[PDB]
Amino acid sequence: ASTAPLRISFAKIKEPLEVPNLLALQTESFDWLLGNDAWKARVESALESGQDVPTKSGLEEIFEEISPIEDFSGSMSLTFRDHRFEPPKNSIDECKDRDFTYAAPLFVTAEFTNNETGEIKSQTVFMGDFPLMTNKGTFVINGTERVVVSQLVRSPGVYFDSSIDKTSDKDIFSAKIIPSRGAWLEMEIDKRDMVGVRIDRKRKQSVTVLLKALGWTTEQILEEFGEYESMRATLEKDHTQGQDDALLDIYRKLRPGEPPTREAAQTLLENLYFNPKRYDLAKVGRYKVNKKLGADEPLDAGVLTTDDVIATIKYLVKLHAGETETVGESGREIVVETDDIDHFGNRRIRNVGELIQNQVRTGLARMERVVRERMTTQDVEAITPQTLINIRPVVASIKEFFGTSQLSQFMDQNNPLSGLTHKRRLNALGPGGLSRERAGFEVRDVHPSHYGRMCPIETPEGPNIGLIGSLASYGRINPFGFIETPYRKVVEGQVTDDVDYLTADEEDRFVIAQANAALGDDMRFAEARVLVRRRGGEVDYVPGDDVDYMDVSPRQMVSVATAMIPFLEHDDANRALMGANMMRQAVPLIKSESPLVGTGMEYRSAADAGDVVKAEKAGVVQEVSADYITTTNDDGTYITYRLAKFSRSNQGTSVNQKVIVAEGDRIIEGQVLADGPATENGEMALGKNLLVAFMPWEGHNYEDAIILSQRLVQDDVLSSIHIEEHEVDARDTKLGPEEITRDIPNVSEEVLADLDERGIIRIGAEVVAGDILVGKVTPKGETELTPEERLLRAIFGEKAREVRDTSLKVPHGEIGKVIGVRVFDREEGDELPPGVNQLVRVYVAQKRKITDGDKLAGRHGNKGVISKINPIEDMPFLEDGTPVDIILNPLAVPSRMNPGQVLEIHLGWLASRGWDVSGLAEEWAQRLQVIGADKVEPGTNVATPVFDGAREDELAGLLQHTIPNRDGERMVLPSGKARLFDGRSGEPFPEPISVGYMYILKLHHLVDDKLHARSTGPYSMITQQPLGGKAQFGGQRFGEMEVWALEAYGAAYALQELLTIKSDDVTGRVKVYEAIVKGENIPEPGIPESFKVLIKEMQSLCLNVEVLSSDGMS
Amino acid sequence: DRGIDLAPRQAVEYACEKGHRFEMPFSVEAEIPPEWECKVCGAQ
């Protein structure tokens, strides 16, 4: 009810289904893995509701899969019965502070059973520190926050492909059986009018040899397989016969060089495919095989039998026959057709639970290997379950997954949208997936089965375009793992209040309507002719009662980040992609205001973010403060919500949390207590509302640039807090331990004026470039004093301890206030890495204001650097003396093809000065009256849903009926433009210029860190070129095309000196610096050191590389 | 390297069992060792 702030909605149609939890994709999966109380509550709720749901937790399944193993004699065994968890030894803030991993100990009950002695040793053994996902949906390891993205992967099963070869001039068919982990077999038919089998693509063979090597001999093969000419041609051209002969043939073909053996070949064939251990097909693989091949009730879990391969033979030859409808072997009537790899029913997401389960399974397999090695070298009656098992591979595998793996990614904490997008992304890269190098056009294309399952807009625009996509707003997850999506059930044209979630498979056999279809007073269709989609994504319509499923919302196709944009349906898809890809880069500001125009789901995109403080239990507020909110609940318990103030996110932006509740107001469950970063009043707020004037202005906004007032500098509109962290530690090296101290050598006393007694800068000390923060002195450096330095030391007198100034100093071009210092000591109880003794952390924060070169952007993909911060009086002001806050080039919108932002500025102007429409007796007036957008006070935020937004007629009519401000005269003409004066000249601009209020974002591609320059800094070691990087004072790379351009100019000298003098000439750089400082001319260049490295490399590959001049050698 | 006077150097000839002869310098104040390696084959 009163959970969200007031936002006037332009939605014409209702939503029977609300958007589900935005963090279900992480929290639900990890609850499945843990088997906690929430997961068992969910499974019992689904069981009593009849919904399909896994009854096995992610760890009890992985422990029951590890069967009681036996030795070669089959005597003694160990079994892991039950697993349990203990409360973590550290709090979440404690782990986030002192570089700990948020983990809890994992305990399992293990018994050791030997049949000969009848001895059972039941024991509880510590298996390792198990990391836990927070309620926020993130993992806190090593003090940082890392999230694990879900991974798209090919579903295991049987895949069936069709191709045409130009040389063959005939259709060739291919059959694949790819398992979850086991070996893969490839099949193809009529490559040269014969059919063959590939066993890991090793050697040439036929299909008949595989059949005779299996349980069937010749007569049943020629009997059952009785209507295909090509395969019996292959059978008759095959010369060998007999089961043992075929077995020795496949044994010698797979691995030549050894004599054939019946038992060895049989065991190898059993272990390759039929082994339950090495071919553990997942539940998804078995389900897809019995779905595609029609196997009725095959073992729900297990390895394939010969019957699966025989049904594969059936399906392949039936497809090659040409007919498409036949009865499935050992089953019912099925369909026969080839399927593409890009259909989204063939793509399954590995969520965080399945990935962590796989890593724990690999660690457990290594542990079983170690223990199997251990039992064979151990005696009975002396083995304890605490002893023989080793948990080192398990924790090693878990720490290898959580650290330095491509799925476990550093969480982007620019703003809550970036967090939600990161936790909602689906990745196709990483281990067990498709790499960027191996990608192609087919996988990246949007499939017609992506509707409601994956967002077609938002995706990285770099080299990996379309490889990484974001989950749709309404997308759910199967128990199996496919991506589901809701639909409203339709019966006899009377749509009901029932919802069914359809995979990418059931979406083909049905026909899907639209949520934009009109309905009458009842739930019947208002029009017989409705625009629908069917199998293959064909958009052909059908009239009358012929549909059977309607969408739940028109926002079903879009993600959470894309659905933020108002008037998306007017924007191009490329600029929509850019707009959804820059809203994850906008920083939060000092005080953020919610956008005046925007989609009404903006509340749900920040309420579901964990950074906004929400009430755990309903109650009343006792006291409020900027540090804590204390609420006395209804039952009587007391809870204080601690608020993070000016902490540092992973990207450096501040995460301060304002308070919006009063001293004694009512709080219900789920109510927002304290705003997060980039949020106002529990509503999400990335940027600012700025007065836009679409006109060229003296060329300072030429080529997609921005002009903006000083009114955004002096009013502190677009500014942000930037906390930068950099630390140093004290270590005991070979010469001695360096100490943090005060007596910095050979420096003036004024430099050390702002230090403490222990060598720590004061909290709140203003710092600049090159200033001292913590004073650390190097215990010893090599002393080779020249006589000049010796006599200078004799003249002045030098301190007797020989120390070198390697204390921590502020890097170049950085200013700020020291807001917090953290000191760790080895002598205290705090843990430190080996070798170090003192570790100090210093936070410096600056309030970066807007300036030249900062990158700003809208929501519709418009973007640009800032070229001029004008004075207030220079801006073109309106008819009442209101200057515009930002000036835009209007040349951008026709070429870039995003006229939705013009609609956005018009609706922003309407949302600033409200409208009074009542009794106008027009169609748009009646629509606004029945909707509720008829009486709107000035300043209230408006809501246009992403595909239900306000129409052009509504905007024009509201432009005709804006509330007056002064003199009883509205300012913007019904054409949408207003007569705009001038600041510099004063005379009015000739014709009206479009004005409005567009939400303007401030990107994190800032100018205060992009500036970087080099004169002479650090150099690389293996080659004497200057190194690179902003934090390392590097030099800009002069690439190959640069050298081509300088050759093209014919400027030999400039190119030659850029290649020799200014880099990689050790005898040249120092001489040139000396010549410049002394004032004499630049010396002649020598030979670059990289060429000498080349010569020394070639000379070591036994290549007699010698340089000889005209006279002789060198 | 400007104005620095190098130490006086003497030439001592070392011969191995394979007949290889090489010339390498020694300092005047430094002691002359009768044992050394061969630059060509590493013999005594």
Partner: protein
């Protein structure tokens, strides 16, 4: 015969002997170009050339030890084979068979593996180099210039 004559006639006209196709000595990179640099925290970082040279030297020492005493022909032949394969891996890790991985993640980069491609000397450090006296920042439009 055309290819064989276009190869053999190279050794006739030119004065370099064809002995060098099979070698008895292996030169070593000078130690800076295959460095072992001290880092913060006591950790060390070494180039893979040092590891390959260490492998070759270990196997050559073991072969010398087998030739010192009386050893069976299978063992000496296997030692010479692993010596030849280690020298081959030094000159070209990954040319034949499974490359010598090392840590278990990526193959070691041999001499040639850094004379080649985008990471080679020819294309990353000779034609295009970093430069001193250079700078970079974003651009803005100035009509007053």
């Amino acid at each position: 015969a055309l290819k064989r004559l276009k190869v053999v006639s190279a050794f006739l006209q030119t004065s370099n002997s064809p002995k060098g196709m099979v070698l008895d000595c292996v030169p070593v990179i000078p130690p800076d170009l295959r460095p072992m640099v001290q880092l913060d925290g006591g950790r060390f970082a070494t180039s893979d050339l040092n590891d390959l040279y260490r492998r070759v030297i270990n196997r050559n020492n073991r072969l010398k030890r087998l030739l010192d005493l009386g050893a069976p022909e299978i063992i000496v032949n296997n030692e010479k084979r692993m010596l030849q394969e280690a020298v081959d891996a030094l000159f070209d890790n990954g040319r034949r068979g499974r490359p010598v991985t090392g840590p278990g993640n990526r193959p070691l980069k041999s001499l040639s593996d850094m004379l080649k491609g985008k990471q080679g000397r020819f294309r990353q450090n000779l034609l295009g180099k970093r430069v001193d006296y250079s700078a970079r920042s974003v651009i803005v439009v100035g009509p007053q210039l």
